[PDB]
Amino acid sequence: TYMKIADYGQLGEYTCDAKCDAEFGEPGNIRHLEGKTYDYRGVFCFNRKNLQ
Amino acid sequence: TYMKIADYGQLGEYTCDAKCDAEFGEPGNIRHLEGKTYDYRGVFCFNRKNLQ
């Protein structure tokens, strides 16, 4: 699994320089998603004399 | 709290010089009384830029 961080939020605002506070901003998402892995296999035979 | 010695009693009497005893006298009061203390407070604010 791995992280995917979606989109940074909009944090700052350019407020007026009189208020004693900021204003909340939008958040960001991270979307911890996963993914699997497959396998590849097969066989093959032989005689023993017919290979010597 | 503190003491408040009220009034010394009248102890001696100038009795005659024959009796084999004294004579009781008035007692004194001490009046352990108390008193509290007050407090003084207030506030004031500022901006930060407008003070720099």
Resolution rounded to one decimal, in angstroms:
3.5
**Long-range contacts of range A23-29, CB-CB < 8 Å, 24 or more positions apart?**
A29/A5
The shortest C-alpha distance from B45 to chain A (Å) reads 11
Chain A interface with B: residues with Cβ < 8 Å: 17-18, 20
Q: Which residues of B touch A (CB under 8 A)?
A: 47, 49
Distance CA A27, CA A6 (A): 10
Contact between A20 and B49 using a beta-carbon 8 Å cutoff: no
The answer for B49, left when phi > 0, alpha when psi is -120 to 50, beta otherwise, is alpha
Cα–Cα dist A27/B21, whole Å:
99
| Cα gap A26→A20, rounded to integer Å | 20
Q: How far is A27 from chain B (nearest CA, A)?
A: 28
As given in the structure block, the two tokens for residue A39 are 């396998």
